[PDB]
Design a protein around this ligand. Sequence first.
Ligand SMILES: [Zn+2]
Ligand SMILES: [Zn+2]
Ligand SMILES: [Zn+2]
Ligand SMILES: [Zn+2]
Ligand SMILES: [Zn+2]
Ligand SMILES: [Zn+2]
Lengths: 56, 131, 185, 48, 331, 144, 171, 167, 86
Amino acid sequence: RCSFEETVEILFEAGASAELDDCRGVSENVILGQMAPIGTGAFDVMIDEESLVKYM
Amino acid sequence: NKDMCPICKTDRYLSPDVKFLVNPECYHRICESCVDRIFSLGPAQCPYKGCDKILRKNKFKTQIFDDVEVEKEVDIRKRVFNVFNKTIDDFNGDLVEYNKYLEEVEDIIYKLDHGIDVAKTEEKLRTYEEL
Amino acid sequence: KTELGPLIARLRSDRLISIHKQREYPPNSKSVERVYYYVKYPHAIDAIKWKVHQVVQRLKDDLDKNSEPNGYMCPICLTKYTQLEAVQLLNFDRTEFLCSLCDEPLVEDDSGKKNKEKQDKLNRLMDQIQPIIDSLKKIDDSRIEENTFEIALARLIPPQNQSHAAYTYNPKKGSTMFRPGDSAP
Amino acid sequence: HNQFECKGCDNKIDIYQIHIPYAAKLLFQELMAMNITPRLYTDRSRDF
Amino acid sequence: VGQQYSSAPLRTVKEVQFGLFSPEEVRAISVAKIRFPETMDETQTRAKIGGLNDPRLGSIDRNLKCQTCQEGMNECPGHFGHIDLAKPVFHVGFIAKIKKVCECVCMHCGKLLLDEHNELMRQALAIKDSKKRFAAIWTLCKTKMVCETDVPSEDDPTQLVSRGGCGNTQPTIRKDGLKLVGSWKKDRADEPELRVLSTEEILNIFKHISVKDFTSLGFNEVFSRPEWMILTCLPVPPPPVRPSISFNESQRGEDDLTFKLADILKANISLETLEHNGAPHHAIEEAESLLQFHVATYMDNDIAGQPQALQKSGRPVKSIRARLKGKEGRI
Amino acid sequence: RGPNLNIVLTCPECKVYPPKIVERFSEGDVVCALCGLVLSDKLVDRVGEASNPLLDGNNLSTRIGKGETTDMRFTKELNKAQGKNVMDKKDNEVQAAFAKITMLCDAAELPKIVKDCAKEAYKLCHDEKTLKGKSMESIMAASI
Amino acid sequence: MFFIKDLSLNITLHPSFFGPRMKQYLKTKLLEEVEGSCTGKFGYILCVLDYDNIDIQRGRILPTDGSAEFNVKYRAVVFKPFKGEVVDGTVVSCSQHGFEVQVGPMKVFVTKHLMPQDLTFNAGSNPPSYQSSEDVITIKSRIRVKIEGCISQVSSIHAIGSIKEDYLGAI
Amino acid sequence: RRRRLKKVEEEENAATLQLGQEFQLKQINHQGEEEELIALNLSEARLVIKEALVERRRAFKRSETREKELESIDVLLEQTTGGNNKDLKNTMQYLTNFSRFRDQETVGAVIQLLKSTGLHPFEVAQLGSLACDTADEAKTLIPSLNNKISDDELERILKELSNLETL
Amino acid sequence: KEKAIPKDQRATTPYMTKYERARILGTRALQISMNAPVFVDLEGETDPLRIAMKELAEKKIPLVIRRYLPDGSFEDWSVEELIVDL
Ligand SMILES: [Zn+2]
Ligand SMILES: [Zn+2]
Ligand SMILES: [Zn+2]
Ligand SMILES: [Zn+2]
Ligand SMILES: [Zn+2]
Ligand SMILES: [Zn+2]
């Protein structure tokens, strides 16, 4: 919300209300500099041990 | 001057939690706060003006009776009776023998308390417990 | 007035003296606010009791602190290091403790010989401060009534012959306003 | 010296490192000066 | 080259919890105490110890280390100081919120003016979301002008059930400048009674608010308590937040925040000296207002109705709020 | 008498001390001139105030003035409170002398440096035992 | 003191080991990265029990690094020191500040203030030793030390002990 | 799980049997079942470590007095362990030179002996690690034992421990 | 693990998405560029991305895509079993 308008007023209200931010949107992750859960980031890429043995 | 620690002088009024402990070796009253600060590391000389007998923190115990002299009598009595223990049947009903034995153990306590002859009495106690 | 300021301010800070400001309306001059000073015994006794305990407690804590090992310090950066903290900063040869900021040998701290001096300090204060505890013991036995500006006026001995200040408490008629620390049981 | 400490918490074993933009670090510190405390936690408290 | 290797685990931020700094937390977090309003010593060679640019707070020079972590400029994140204010001051951004809370709770015993015994209050307390619950509570409790030591029983009107109260009539609080002024209405025998609600007085009441009382108002016990909206200890941002720039490197310039912090220290020291000796009540009040203005302008220089802090050149001082807001702000 | 807190950039590989260091400002790098190893990257090149270190020492102050919206009542009291500062009073005397030096120099159509030297000369020689029984007018004229 | 503790670790594997025998590499990494390591939480991790039954969870590829992060659950024996514990060890070295014993993977420092008054440092004897009427403390000697304090860092543990109490010191 | 802020934590002290927030009496294994804290004395720890090393050696290849024993452990440790084994090497050397019970039979009896006291797992491990001749020595060396076991039981336990150990 | 939907009750599409293909190709290309064992025969290729494309065509990428759900539950889909039709 602070990324749009009333940046300081919103942040003060969150401090008084002790708001908890779960960092789901693009704005939170962009602020924190981490891959947002969008597009290619909407999933996790894991390593399959069951398949490594069978490709050789 | 009957409700304060002689060393730290922590009056009960300002420190209602103060608790006093006594040591069998010299039977001196010391508050719990002083015991930890001076004996936690290990044995040390008693913190009294004219007392140079070493003591350990583990030996401290709470005083039962309000008279220090009786405490010495009772604890010495307990130590003596731990070795000199007998009953009427031990002498097969010989009350005369039992009465003499009671005096002997009673006399031993008297000498040990007042230290008339510490060496002979303590040596006497040492030999009997093995039997 | 300048010399009186420090005395009143410090006494007010310790709550040995209470203040009371009320609007006065002299019949012949424009109204001016007057300041009166008195003693609220529950406040002063409460303040005295806490301070006596704190001073005694501080010495006892300080006496206990002095019984612990001395410690260590760096002569250059003047940074104090505890025994635990100094152990992990020693050199490879394990012969002398080394500082972090300075990489210089440390120096053992003082206060090793004060084990008796602080005990003497505590002994003197308890003997000197005896009358306070005795007075407090009697105070606790009885019950004191909290003093107020109006109540204190009952024992007033006028200081001057024609003092300008009116030593009267005429509370404003039916006023619901309440000021901090201006009401007593 | 491979030593970490958070004075005021009396802990030296519960430290984590996070990669954030220097602007993000500046923002939180500025919020800290404004009496607002932003706390960065590495695990979820409430259920998703 | 990059940053040095660290043995701490590397994670990703999953949640951000906001709140307010407690006075204790600021002192514990702080690495040094700032007591001198200067930045450099008399020789202008090294930063003065205990000053604004204390070496313990960090370093912004490429040739100097940090006295705390002994790490370079690119590795030191900065360390926070703290200033012990002589008297409590309001947070400029929470003055409006403080006013609403003051009306909600009694100004003598710090208890909510309306309890669960009122049907309307029960509906207001039943609201889940904190923000609207606080608004509903404020609407019902702002009109109450008496603590109601005794309240009629819900079951029947004949009998009255006693509740925690003191019977003192509540004031009609109004915001004048940076001060909260309360007024009292007296029963007709007229003119109302007017006096200024001291920040210390309001802080005392906020400390008396029960845990259940301010949780209903939307405050969090662990993180955000109403008492912490009043600043008693001021954290000092590290030098990185307020770097010192150089134009030709023979002239030294300081950030706007540094001067504001210097002003706070000068005002704080002046108030301490005044209250220490003499300082009639009139002099104390003016000094306290000066400290409030500097702290408010330091956090926010754009306050309606208040004068603006101006630099030597005359331009307005750039505050923290100005840095964060706007199209060119931090966000 | 204080912590070193000094960093010297030397090439770990070349080991030659003192080293040949070239500052690539455009690339923002500090690179060894012999081997090319980079010793420091991410080099750094209104949000400030113009400060003069010598004639004013270390004195930071801010003025209070009107804004786009402001009530005259608040401005007057704040200025009154600011003036009654015991610590800032001592430095105000030097500033007051500087103001009079500026007026005298400006009225004389003298260059800026002449005014600067007069102000600096007063500061260096003020607050000394020898010059205590001399009129301030003579002090200012001698500095000018 | 020695404990059998259940521990978990996050192991990162370079893609060069993303082969059919990657499980063996993880097991090798655990031994080379856990055994012989020190942690302030669980203490010195000495040996890994049930090496053949280490639970390896599915690996997650790091976005930028490209390496797979594996959560590994294993059972290992850890030596965790405690304050107030009584341990026996060998005096590895001696110096003016004090002599430190070698207790398992840890070294306990005995300060002069934590030593009895009778013992005094003597640098004239080679090797240096603390000499008293009843016993002499020298390198390789056996000492019963009571840990009077422990400081635990994320990857280091240091302890200080005393021998002033009874039934302590030379064994 | 929500109140993450600082809470007053009990100091790590062995005398009070406060082992910390991670070494509590009740422990949860990887499966999830509740288990008791596993505390090993010097003899038990030596056997457990060696039993794992010997099994480890078998896995690779397949797919006595103190002096000679010390050499035997030395060669085994290097063969069946990887790099950075400095800490483990000292541990095995320390355990052999300080362990009191050699084989499983004596170690098994010791466990079969002290478990009847019902003491804390930390206390029982201490008793099997430190050799005490009198009840007073054990009480002072292990303060937690105080007011938990009477001197009558403690005296016989130590006596039986001494008669169950030979070198 | 209540957040791991069993393979028998997976309700997501059996087709690889463009984002999944892009990340899988990029994820494996980075591994190839960092000397990862290539499981496909190369008739001459030096670009890691082109090698990954060859592996995807012949279904020799040993990765599983963990598709997350708005409630936190996830489903594991192997690249081999995912249909690449886009
Ligand atoms: Zn005492
Ligand atoms: Zn004595
Ligand atoms: Zn130093
Ligand atoms: Zn730093
Ligand atoms: Zn009320
Ligand atoms: Zn070079």
